[PDB]
DNA sequence: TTTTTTCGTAGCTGAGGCCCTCAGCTACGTTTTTTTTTT
DNA sequence: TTTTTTCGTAGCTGAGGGCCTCAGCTACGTTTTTTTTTT
């Protein structure tokens, strides 16, 4: 189990809800939590489901060099 | 779309959390707390094994389906923070692991081999050989009374017996409030514990014919190594409200105990020793 | 087995009984002793109060869709009763009490005698054979092409008309069943004819009564073709839950079927 | 060493910046690292003396029940 | 307003960071890389020991002045990546170490003393008694040929000696190319480590002379646990392009063993066998 | 030592030499063998090319502020050369040798011989009368209201104009006289006053040189009473140092203040 | 055989635009299948 | 002694507004102090 950080943009509703199942939303499309990564793996097969035309960032701790690792949804300046 | 929604395990949640005086209600899919002034608070339901609402609470049918669906206990406490009622969902249970308990239940020697094994498990050794349950039921008696009387000593505090009154939480005593509060909790996660891992509450060796009896049983086992150690700690200080303080305090033991960890592991152990070769 | 279906509103308490309230004041007062189970239909809100005078008294709340349609969640949850249970499960586990059971389940449904000579495994046969037989005759009666029963459980939109009005038709009465269930105090998951599945006793129960009135609706709606035929078949099950009373039917039918095992049932 | 998240909303550019200078930005105004302790109150007080008018989440990593704790600097409705 | 910007340990740090073919500035005041298509990627400079900047890169003086400022080495790598030169805040070094570090460098007794110390950490065991500097130098040259040997035969790797050519990097050996790389990385966090310390590179005592003797002396003792190794593995492969493939390894070397946390301890545990009283 | 300092351009190399780039084309052209320090100017930019180059010659890269009122950054961190650095603390760690050293600095300093029966610690107290003794003449011939040398380290805005300017004086002279002592291969924080500290040495030096020149110009700007006065002070400081070379004039002098240990000096 | 002001970066400001939030309205109680290949 | 439509929540849409980004311009090379209490 290790910290998991997703940020939503221009997302529909009802990801904004169905993140807010199993992480806290500390602002707006801004969520954290602490999940194991199958858990993490559910999480994104959600994003990628509910996401539609938006766009999504999921960053998490790791055990690599810099102490996290991030895979993105859609497309982004960053 | 629509994506199903599916509970995550027990052991990769936080233990409880206490909601009082607000509606609860799903807002865009997801568990909300409303209180007097509007006050929005988010709850992440499918993270926590379970949630007690406390008087002043209304939870809307969408919600009490959504802790259902994501597998979250829902738990209604009362004075002194009791357990007094629950929801799940009903079609949770599976049919080998309802069945092996009930076959384990339903024969008195195989029943006597799981409460002599909840016996050993509790007190760090083997059970009198020969002895029936009810023999057994009056050595646990013993065992308890005296651990009750050796904590008492330890934290200092005036112990005058396991008693409270039913229509009045005001005429027993704070040790006894503390108690109650306590285990009310650890029974809140060891419900959560049996019905997530396939099993009926109901059903139980030592305690038998009661809707809680399988609660009891396995919340007995690890009861006085964890929780009620800390309902005397707290009690000796005397507090306002020791309800808050108790809950509080069983929340750290869960997560330093990993209680939930080993909770459903526990439980496949004790109904391992019936010696009849478990479902899968 | 007295039970009342409360929709729109909420459930509190005034004065020691149980009282549906609207922004119309106090829509339906309750008494205590009057209802064993409660079923709250979408639109409702449960209020603490309400809970635990329940729990005083020992009434089961169910969350269920309209009419039953849907199971969501249930008070005392893996049942309230021990003896209940293990009644069933007794019966359950015992080959002999077992057929005696299935050939009283057998006999419910079709209205015959269940063929003395054949074991539970055997009568599977047998039951599918008039399944076969009912759906044909059924589709030859409301004029629709069938060329039998095809589904894919992991996709809806395969299916042509009439197999995804069954199925949800067939969904509903599940919904029911599982209520019905429910509130005479068994576990779903317990069945007789099916069994390893976590409804299994739902699908022996619901297959009883299943060619009686829903199926032949999921027929007629089929032929009908109209825009949303899940949606008017689930609407339809629902209107028939409620005029013929199928839920408090049930609750006497699952106590027969299980008296069938000839072992006394708990008081 | 723990995971570290900030999230800024209308902050200077220098704060912006300075962010930039131990942090990961993977969205505007979204910065993930991993920090010690002092390090992470060090970047904290960088956050104070810098946001002016803006407002600021961050949260990190833990070892308490939730598995993070986070703090916050101006105003925002959550 | 404004407020200082100040360097975080280097045990705290990820150890380094390759940049190639781009412009560096500083926007806004963070370390930026710029590619030929307008790219612009953001570097947390102050979080790194060390940025290795490779052919093709231009740096802007504000971006060489932050990194001086948050106390991060800029190290220029050449061909086969050696390093070829560094920038750094030269007041950066504290007085009190200085000093100490020259008092054990000009006295002979206690330079002894220092290598004798450098050789047991190397090789795990004391150097033989009353042996000059030169005849320690003369030892652990042998024991390095006898490293090499026994290198080359476990990764099956043909050795035909340490050689490069200054003139031309093709003229040298995959084996070699690799080691120079693999050292290069070691010589540039051990700098980093070494500056960060308050010592001078230069000031060394095996290794004397040079601007970074003392560099070498450090990596030394623990190169052959480390870096070398794992350029016999890469360079048994055989690949296009070792230095990436070096580069890599070496940042996962340092990180699993904890290098920089490691390195300035060493620093310390070496200088303080010339039984003076340390500093702080 | 020769040096030259660039701004505003990029540093690169063309046919083995040293080249600095404008909008413009080559603005300056440098041969390799014609500088062994390039001080590099805001608004520079350096290639990697250019870096090579400087590595195989052994030219000493410093980054500065204009004119060198700042050392920011300096390539051969921690110095290049050994018998420099050894030379310069054998000098600072010998008692003896140290008082001659800073007897030579008395010497440069106030123009005329240190008392001899003095230590270095007691010399300090003659220095600091000189010190106050030529901030009051100063005032006085400035027409500057003068109680005295008053500032906060930790605070800059507590002080009146005057000492604010004095600051902000000697903050670029610590500048030049750390690039000079990089240029002529010594370090900084090895000093033999002042000790202790990072920039000890420069301290020194600076010392020496301080009230010829910067202090002065720091009062008369001080009695201009401008809008922005240490801004003012540190561009006065920086037309100095071009105009009358301070840099250059500072190396030759640090040499031959270490000299004076009558020890042998690196080749 | 001079009169060579040129580079890098921060602050400010207005235009543009993305997107977050909510009010007001309409619609709906639903994400289904349980040993399937008819007669 | 009937003709009792009532609650909770999602989708849609337009208005409002907050803020992120960048172009175009102007300004500037800077965040300082080293054994301080004058003569």
Same mark, same amino acid.
């Given at each position: 189990?290790?910290?998991?950080?997703?940020?939503?943009?221009?997302?529909?509703?009802?990801?904004?809800?169905?993140?807010?199942?199993?992480?806290?939303?500390?602002? *707006?499309?801004?969520?954290?939590?602490?999940?194991? *990564?199958?858990?993490?793996?559910?999480?994104?097969? /959600?994003?990628? $489901?509910?996401?539609?035309? $938006?766009?999504?960032?999921? *960053?998490?701790?790791?055990?690599?060099?810099?102490?996290?690792?991030? /895979?993105?949804?859609?497309?982004?300046?960053? | 779309?629509?994506?199903?929604?599916?509970? @995550?395990?027990?052991?990769?949640?936080?233990?409880? !959390?206490?909601?009082?005086?607000?509606?609860?209600?799903? !807002? =865009?899919?997801?568990?909300?707390?409303? =209180?007097?002034?509007?006050?929005?608070?988010? !709850?992440?339901?499918?993270?926590? +094994?379970?949630?007690?609402?406390?008087?002043?609470?209304?939870?809307?049918?969408?919600?009490?389906?959504?802790?259902?669906?994501?597998?979250?206990?829902?738990?209604?406490?009362?004075?002194?923070?009791?357990?007094?009622?629950?929801?799940?969902?009903?079609?949770?249970?599976?049919? =080998?692991?309802?069945?092996?308990?009930?076959?384990?239940?339903?024969?008195?020697?195989?029943?006597?081999?799981?409460?002599?094994?909840?016996?050993?498990?509790?007190?760090?050794?083997?059970?009198?050989?020969?002895?029936?349950?009810?023999?057994?039921?009056? !050595?646990?008696?013993?065992?308890?009374? &005296?651990?009750?009387? %050796?904590? &008492?000593?330890?934290?200092?505090?005036?112990?005058?017996?396991?008693?409270? =009154?039913?229509?009045?939480?005001?005429?027993?005593?704070? @040790?006894?409030?503390?108690?109650?509060?306590?285990?009310?909790?650890?029974?809140?996660?060891?419900?959560?514990?049996?019905?997530? +891992?396939?099993?009926?509450?109901?059903?139980?060796?030592?305690?038998?014919?009661?809707?809680?009896?399988?609660?009891?049983?396995?919340?007995? @086992?690890?009861?006085?190594?964890?929780?009620?150690?800390?309902?005397?700690?707290?009690?000796?200080?005397?507090?306002?409200?020791?309800?808050?303080?108790?809950?509080?305090?069983?929340?750290?033991?869960?997560?330093?105990?990993?209680?939930? &960890?080993? %909770?459903?592991? %526990? @439980?496949?152990?004790?109904?391992?020793?019936?010696?009849?070769?478990?479902?899968?």
């Amino acid at each position: 189990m290790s910290m998991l950080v997703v940020v939503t943009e221009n997302v529909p509703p009802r990801l904004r809800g169905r993140l807010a199942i199993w992480l806290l939303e500390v602002r *707006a499309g801004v969520y954290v939590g602490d999940v194991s *990564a199958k858990i993490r793996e559910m999480i994104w097969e /959600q994003i990628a $489901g509910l996401a539609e035309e $938006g766009n999504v960032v999921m *960053a998490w701790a790791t055990n690599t060099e810099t102490g996290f690792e991030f /895979q993105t949804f859609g497309l982004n300046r960053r | 779309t629509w994506l199903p929604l599916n509970p @995550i395990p027990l052991k990769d949640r936080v233990s409880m !959390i206490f909601l009082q005086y607000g509606q609860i209600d799903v !807002i =865009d899919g997801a568990f909300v707390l409303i =209180d007097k002034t509007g006050i929005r608070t988010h !709850i992440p339901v499918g993270s926590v +094994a379970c949630i007690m609402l406390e008087p002043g609470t209304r939870v809307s049918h969408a919600a009490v389906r959504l802790a259902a669906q994501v597998g979250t206990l829902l738990v209604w406490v009362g004075e002194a923070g009791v357990r007094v009622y629950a929801s799940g969902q009903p079609g949770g249970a599976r049919s =080998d692991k309802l069945l092996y308990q009930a076959k384990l239940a339903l024969d008195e020697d195989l029943r006597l081999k799981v409460v002599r094994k909840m016996f050993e498990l509790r007190f760090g050794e083997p059970a009198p050989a020969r002895r029936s349950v009810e023999q057994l039921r009056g !050595i646990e008696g013993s065992r308890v009374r &005296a651990t009750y009387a %050796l904590l &008492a000593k330890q934290y200092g505090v005036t112990w005058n017996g396991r008693r409270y =009154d039913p229509k009045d939480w005001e005429k027993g005593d704070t @040790i006894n409030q503390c108690i109650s509060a306590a285990t009310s909790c650890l029974y809140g996660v060891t419900e959560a514990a049996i019905l997530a +891992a396939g099993y009926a509450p109901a059903i139980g060796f030592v305690h038998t014919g009661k809707p809680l009896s399988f609660v009891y049983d396995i919340a007995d @086992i690890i009861k006085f190594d964890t929780v009620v150690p800390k309902a005397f700690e707290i009690a000796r200080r005397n507090p306002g409200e020791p309800d808050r303080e108790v809950r509080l305090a069983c929340r750290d033991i869960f997560r330093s105990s990993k209680t939930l &960890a080993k %909770l459903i592991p %526990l @439980i496949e152990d004790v109904l391992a020793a019936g010696e009849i070769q478990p479902p899968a």
